[PDB]
Amino acid sequence: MREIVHVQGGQCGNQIGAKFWEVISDEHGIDPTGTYCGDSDLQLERINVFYNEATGGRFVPRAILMDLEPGTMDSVRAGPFGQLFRPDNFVFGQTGAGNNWAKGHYTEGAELIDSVLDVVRKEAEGCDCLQGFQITHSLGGGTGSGMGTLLISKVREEYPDRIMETFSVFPSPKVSDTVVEPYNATLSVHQLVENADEVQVIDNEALYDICFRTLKLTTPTYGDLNHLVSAAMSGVTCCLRFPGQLNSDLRKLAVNLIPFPRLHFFLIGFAPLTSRGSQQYRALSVPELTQQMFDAKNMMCASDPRHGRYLTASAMFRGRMSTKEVDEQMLNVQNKNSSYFVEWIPNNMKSSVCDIPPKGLKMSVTFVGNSTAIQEMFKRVSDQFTAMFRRKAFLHWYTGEGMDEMEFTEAESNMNDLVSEYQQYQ
């Protein structure tokens, strides 16, 4: 059938994918052990999309966890739902790529990545077809973006028709640590535009805005942030995983969102979201779901869509629902809100219906949107980049191992013309 190979890179990718394998396993009725614990054929029939089978059950995830520092993958192993991964599906690595794109992409990553595509290859042609690759990683970090984006080009050149669907945490400039965030992010987006199919910009800062204002979490930890993203990560791969009235794979999303060859930086929002004691007060009809997923507070990327338009949007619904209540809501947002929707494209939204809701919630929505407002941080990280790069900022730790200065100006140039390409349709 259809198959997804999930590769997680770096501390951020390993910890955000570990929660993903916690919420998929809850959805499929799999213990931390790995046995089924229900009675539902629908919960088990489309399991090969994320789990393999080994003799006496033991449904192992198709996970290729990989890092250059042996500090965060062991934390996945010791935690609950962490023994599911194979011991040889853990590409380790000593020393470390300490916040350097080059220490993951030219040296210290090139030696390890040979073993990484081995583990990828056994979990690629171990089946019959392949829908594509889910790649969680981090642009704001060395070992996350370095061998992260390198792997994006390696598995693209090996399989240049599979869907390269990547969840990346972009460095938002306002409140975030580590100073080399402009150099890692700008260099990694250049590799990410001709080698990835669906880059989902999921910032830490806007996730905090979801936690503080929507959920009203008093102390949102990093597990809270990864719980939100793992929910959006389950909602996009739903129709490969569960039946529905109108189905939509990942290749559906790429065709019905991307008008022109690059143009592939989307914004996600997931929303049965409610305040602390507001579960007794919220409705769960489609109109309140639609009014919530279009709220700018419900963006995982702080790249406010009112400061731009919607080039093409998509909403993959879930749960039991009626088709016209989808359709009239998808049409009413176009008729009422017309300024923040582009004109040269008609009917700027697709919809899908999964008939299997998430666990406990009766209805849910994920909203992947190709918006011409992502250039706000394509300017934000570029202004941070050129403020450093003019008067020769941290570069001796980016030059002595092999990059020349021309790769930095070309990475900023590809950033700049992609800003200009989004500003073309505005």
Added chain:
Amino acid sequence: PPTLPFHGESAYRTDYVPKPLPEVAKPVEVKLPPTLPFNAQSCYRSEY
């Protein structure tokens, strides 16, 4: 003549005395939320 007694302690032996060790055996016990029952049906099975 008398002989005065010797009162003398060097600083290393005055303030680097073998200290009592801190008392540390405190695990962080974590619960697991029970898995919810799977209330979800196919539409084909629901009307047909």
